[PDB]
Ligand binder design. Sequence first.
Ligand SMILES: *[C@@H](O)[C@H](C[C@@H]1CCNC1=O)NC(=O)[C@H](CC(C)C)NC(=O)OCC(C)(C)[S@@](=O)c1ccccc1
Lengths: 301, 299
Amino acid sequence: SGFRKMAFPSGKVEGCMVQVTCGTTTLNGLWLDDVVYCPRHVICTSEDMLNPNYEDLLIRKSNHNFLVQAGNVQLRVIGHSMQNCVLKLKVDTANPKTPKYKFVRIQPGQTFSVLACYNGSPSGVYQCAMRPNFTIKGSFLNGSCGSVGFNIDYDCVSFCYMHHMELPTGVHAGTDLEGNFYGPFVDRQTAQAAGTDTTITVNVLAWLYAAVINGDRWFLNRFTTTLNDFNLVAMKYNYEPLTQDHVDILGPLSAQTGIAVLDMCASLKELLQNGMNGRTILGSALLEDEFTPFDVVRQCS
Amino acid sequence: FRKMAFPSGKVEGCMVQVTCGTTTLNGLWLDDVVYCPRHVICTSEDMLNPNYEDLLIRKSNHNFLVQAGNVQLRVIGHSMQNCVLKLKVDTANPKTPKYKFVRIQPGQTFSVLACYNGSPSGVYQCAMRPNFTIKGSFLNGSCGSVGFNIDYDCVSFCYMHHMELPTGVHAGTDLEGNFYGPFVDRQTAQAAGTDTTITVNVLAWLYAAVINGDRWFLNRFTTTLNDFNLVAMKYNYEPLTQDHVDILGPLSAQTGIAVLDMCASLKELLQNGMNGRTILGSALLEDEFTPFDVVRQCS
Ligand SMILES: *[C@@H](O)[C@H](C[C@@H]1CCNC1=O)NC(=O)[C@H](CC(C)C)NC(=O)OCC(C)(C)[S@@](=O)c1ccccc1
């Protein structure tokens, strides 16, 4: 096809990874300025993980119960607090590798890079898309919690994900960096289930724009649609409805190709209703939904 | 199951920008030497048949502008090793990792740090194709981007980017400046030899699909090594060697599926197709995970 999942370079995030241990439970934390962020379930024994009372568990803890290490080197904890599902550990050293950063809460469909880490040590980097059911298809083993997802804009690292759990079907769930879960999940070792997933329409449209940019445009029809008519049809094919924000983020690709967003929607609608009829797009009979409009521009330009 | 790249930070701290005339690309700064593609020294009227030794002897140290961020590094010497230029600078890179230069075999995988103007832009996993191309994502200005693997603290550099072929695949050198494949650093349209599929890697990925509970493509049958290889060659798959079978041992043990059993399942896929089903999300048989890749990620 000429497209591939591409992560951002991970070095600026690698420089922020530490390990956090409480008892024998070690996970990863994110060290920015003089604060380390990590999943609050580090304070849980395996027994607590069944039905933890986090407020009560935290009361029993003191600064001297947290072992924070950058590599083998201990970072002294001088303060702690809980913000939703993340623990914030104030430390006595500002991280000299702290990048320009911010904390962002993403929407389904947005992609980000994951720096998978174990014992504070990066193992691999790969791109994930936040699914409409607020799960990601990660590659996470025991000890991966506290690994983060991020995007990089110029010099600024936008942190959008911190890893907390795996679901029965093998997909993954987590929080933003303010500790608010994506989706209806809770940090308890209880049976939970991912909602039925849907196709990320805005990313499929980005994919069709990519195909057009590359001269593959058999599927462009002469018709258009309203956003409401398109949304009602799309849901019948298990595609997500479009938001105004989706229409807006397709703006640049619409301008680059001269194909109005609602005209592309009518072309997609015909593909949904009539199928590919044996044809391919960018070399495939399957439509791709894990490239955002930004991902497309990045790899086409 | 995720195609996973190595963390790129150790390589990012080595990337610099190299400019000669109106040509800019990337260099790799290790200790006091910057490595980059030699075609940086070529002008327009040079690129079609460049007599590189002749063009290089006519250059001075000051013709090369090297920048690390906002800082210019003074070139105090230069030499050429095959298709790579080595620029000696007056400063050591303190971010130089432990490293080695390796020449990888077809079928082996590596991470690419794609860079533009000395700035890292993206990281992804690639495999050396049997025809010695790589299916990369590289645009104008990407030359000098490198491919690498990481072992403990040691970066093994295996690839430096030089060119795109008309089919959209890519070609480059090892860090001794020798091309992978029959390609030449001149501005001409070059075709590669017929590519084939990396069979040992397809098998590794089928084991990965089982390990993740996807086992619809399995069958009860078995095959001999030679009969499988006859079918593989027919379908433009690479031969499977006994070393490959042995390399696949751990994945075999993990799943309790003998290698030649999985070969029989792959034979069925080749002859019957996937029938619209998918494996690990893919409509196609994936051949850019090595056995090591699969094991390291499932461990
Ligand atoms: C880095 O300098 C650059 C990377 C290329 C640019 C686009 N994607 C890449 O991967 N390398 C080159 O531009 C390279 C330079 C020569 C080795 C001196 N040339 C190259 O890759 O040319 C691509 C062709 C497909 C050959 S295009 O230029 C062409 C040439 C002749 C006839 C048809 C098409």
